[PDB]
Amino acid sequence: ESADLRALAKHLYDSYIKSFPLTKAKARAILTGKTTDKSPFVIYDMNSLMMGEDKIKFEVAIRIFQGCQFRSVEAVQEITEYAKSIPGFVNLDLNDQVTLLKYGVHEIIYTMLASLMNKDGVLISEGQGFMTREFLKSLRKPFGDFMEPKFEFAVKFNALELDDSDLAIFIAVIILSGDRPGLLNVKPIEDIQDNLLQALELQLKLNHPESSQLFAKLLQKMTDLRQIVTEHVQLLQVIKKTETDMSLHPLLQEIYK
Amino acid sequence: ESADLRALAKHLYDSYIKSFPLTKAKARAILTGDKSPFVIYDMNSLMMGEDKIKFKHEVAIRIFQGCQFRSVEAVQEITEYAKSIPGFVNLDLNDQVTLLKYGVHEIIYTMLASLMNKDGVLISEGQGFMTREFLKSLRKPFGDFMEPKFEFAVKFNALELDDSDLAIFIAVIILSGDRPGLLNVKPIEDIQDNLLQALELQLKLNHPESSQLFAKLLQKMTDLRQIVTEHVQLLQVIKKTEPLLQEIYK
Numbered sequence: 068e069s070a071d072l073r074a075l076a077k078h079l080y081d082s083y084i085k086s087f088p089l090t091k092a093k094a095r096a097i098l099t100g101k102t103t104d105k106s107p108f109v110i111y112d113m114n115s116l117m118m119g120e121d122k123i124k125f126e127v128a129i130r131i132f133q134g135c136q137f138r139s140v141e142a143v144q145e146i147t148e149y150a151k152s153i154p155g156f157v158n159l160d161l162n163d164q165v166t167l168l169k170y171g172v173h174e175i176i177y178t179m180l181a182s183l184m185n186k187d188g189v190l191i192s193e194g195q196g197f198m199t200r201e202f203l204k205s206l207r208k209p210f211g212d213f214m215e216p217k218f219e220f221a222v223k224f225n226a227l228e229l230d231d232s233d234l235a236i237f238i239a240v241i242i243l244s245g246d247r248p249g250l251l252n253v254k255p256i257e258d259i260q261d262n263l264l265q266a267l268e269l270q271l272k273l274n275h276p277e278s279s280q281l282f283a284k285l286l287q288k289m290t291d292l293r294q295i296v297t298e299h300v301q302l303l304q305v306i307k308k309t310e311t312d313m314s315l316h317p318l319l320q321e322i323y324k
Numbered sequence: 325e326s327a328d329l330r331a332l333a334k335h336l337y338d339s340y341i342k343s344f345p346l347t348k349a350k351a352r353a354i355l356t357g358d359k360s361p362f363v364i365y366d367m368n369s370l371m372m373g374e375d376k377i378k379f380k381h382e383v384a385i386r387i388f389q390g391c392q393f394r395s396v397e398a399v400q401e402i403t404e405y406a407k408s409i410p411g412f413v414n415l416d417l418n419d420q421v422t423l424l425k426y427g428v429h430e431i432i433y434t435m436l437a438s439l440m441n442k443d444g445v446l447i448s449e450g451q452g453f454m455t456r457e458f459l460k461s462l463r464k465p466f467g468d469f470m471e472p473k474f475e476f477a478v479k480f481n482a483l484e485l486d487d488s489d490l491a492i493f494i495a496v497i498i499l500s501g502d503r504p505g506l507l508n509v510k511p512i513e514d515i516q517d518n519l520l521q522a523l524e525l526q527l528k529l530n531h532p533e534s535s536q537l538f539a540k541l542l543q544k545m546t547d548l549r550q551i552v553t554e555h556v557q558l559l560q561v562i563k564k565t566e567p568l569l570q571e572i573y574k
């Protein structure tokens with residue numbers, strides 16, 4: 068019945084606002100550059116980077132790498148917080164809860180990071196700054212293509228023009244995957260996701276009526292997601308061996324078996 | 325006026341049923357009157373108890389954590405129930421969070437009393453009953469965690485409140501306008517001065533010869549907040565004992 072599926076889309080959109088302070092709605096306000104309320108300092112080269120550290124709160128390529136690292140730790144927390152509010156999730160076997168978070172987090176991060184990107188760069192520092200795609204594309208040996216495949220996915224994914232109320236149901240679907248390695252009761256995860264997909268389906272049809280087969284389009288973006296996850300993971304084990312003086316966070320480490 | 329407060333009351337009761345599966349009427353039945361739950365009185369019964377019971381997970385650590393998982397489910401039950409309170413969803417979303425952040429513990433200890441008698445607590449959604457003694461008997465850090473919760477339950481249950489009393493009572497807790505960092509207390513206390521009006525009528529209709537039960541219930545709000553502070557400082561102590569799992573129980 069639609070009334071329950073609509074109700075679920077409201078509940079989900081409500082914690083999503085409550086759990087992620089940097090929404091696509093606020094990111095596109097900033098990114099459109101029409102609003103003078105608070106336009107971002109642009110970091111486009113090494114020099115404006117050093118100028119950036121004066122009026123913006125946050126070698127070079129390393130401290131930026133460790134930057135994403137800290138914001139990833141922080142996103143895992145927000146995603147974790149959002150997960151709890153998905154009906155039925157905290158009722159699952161704790162081992163399955165932990166397993167849905169081990170795998171769903173990366174895919175939600177890049178999904179949410181898309182909100183903060185356009186073809187030319189990414190809002191950094193809670194939107195205070197804008198860091199350029201080509202400046203990120205030009206950092207030292209291995210760092211220069213940490214972020215470029217996230218740009219590619221975002222350009223492709225942002226083409227769907229989802230707003231936050233669609234992303235809310237969709238990132239819930241990502242969390243509730245019954246096909247994650249090592250799950251103990253796949254079936255109750257599948258029952259929740261069944262319902263989330265139902266909610267997402269009516270939501271996509273209502274929020275984007277003329278945009279036909281958006282659901283099918285979106286579901287198929289989760290191929291690009293698992294791909295981007297895997298490039299990042301192996302591209303991370305080079306840096307483990309490139310720089311043994313640089314340290315992965317315990318929390319993110321446990322999300323990388 | 326009277327019959328709106330009664331409409332408000334039965335709204336809350338009806339909604340509290342949906343949101344809280346094990347109710348005090350349900351609980352009280354198991355504790356004294358078939359469908360009796362497995363009892364954990366010592367170490368021996370516990371190891372057999374996990375074997376036969378349906379639970380998601382050192383012993384004192386395991387019981388402590390089991391209390392954290394239930395806690396997190398309660399937060400979801402209370403959160404789902406809070407959204408049914410007239411006017412709640414329309415408050416500033418920042419204030420909804422603040423009310424829930426602080427009100428959540430006081431609701432948990434209120435509803436935990438429903439599952440407690442002087443001898444122990446109904447556990448495992450009522451499928452078990454863990455004796456109060458066996459929780460006393462836990463290690464110095466863990467053995468005084470749930471004793472004050474029992475102490476409160478004994479006093480609170482002496483009020484002999486039912487689920488329809490508790491429906492309105494727990495709403496009142498959530499719409500407390502003295503929680504730190506509220507941006508717009510006016511509506512919060514407009515809803516509370518409404519919930520209290522209906523709790524007044526409800527108690528007087530349903531406990532007509534229990535004079536000043538309303539006053540007595542509101543003073544028990546004092547004891548709720550002192551238990552929250554007791555429990556908080558107790559976690560201070562045990563934070564001196566020991567990652568994704570930790571991120572869930574923050």
Ligand SMILES: COc1ccc(C(=O)n2c(C)c(Cc3cccc(O[C@@H](C)C(=O)O)c3)c3cc(OC(F)(F)F)ccc32)cc1
Binds near residue numbers: 180189191198
């Ligand atoms: C899952 O939800 C979120 C997704 C992204 C963000 C976010 O602010 N990020 C930004 C702007 C970034 C981009 C960025 C670039 C340089 C420094 C950064 O750190 C600080 C200065 C910041 O800008 O937040 C951040 C980001 C990167 C991340 O790691 C990655 F996904 F790439 F593996 C994770 C989150 C990131 C926050 C929550």
Ligand SMILES: COc1ccc(C(=O)n2c(C)c(Cc3cccc(O[C@@H](C)C(=O)O)c3)c3cc(OC(F)(F)F)ccc32)cc1
Binds near residue numbers: 397445447448
């Ligand atoms: C709507 O509010 C509540 C919802 C559930 C419960 C509940 O079942 N609890 C029980 C039986 C308990 C007692 C208990 C003891 C040992 C193990 C427990 O975990 C399992 C058995 C369970 O989830 O019931 C639970 C409990 C404890 C809690 O944390 C505390 F408040 F004490 F800090 C919170 C909820 C608890 C109590 C109030």
Ligand SMILES: *c1ccc([N+](=O)[O-])cc1C(=O)Nc1ccccc1
Binds near residue numbers: 132139203209210214
């Ligand atoms: C973020 C911004 C820039 C770079 N870089 O120039 O290499 C890298 C990252 C990034 O994704 N860092 C990271 C490391 C470990 C775990 C999560 C994120």
Ligand SMILES: *c1ccc([N+](=O)[O-])cc1C(=O)Nc1ccccc1
Binds near residue numbers: 390469
């Ligand atoms: C529940 C049962 C037993 C113990 N113990 O013996 O230490 C503790 C608890 C408990 O309430 N744990 C808890 C921790 C943090 C937040 C809520 C509940």
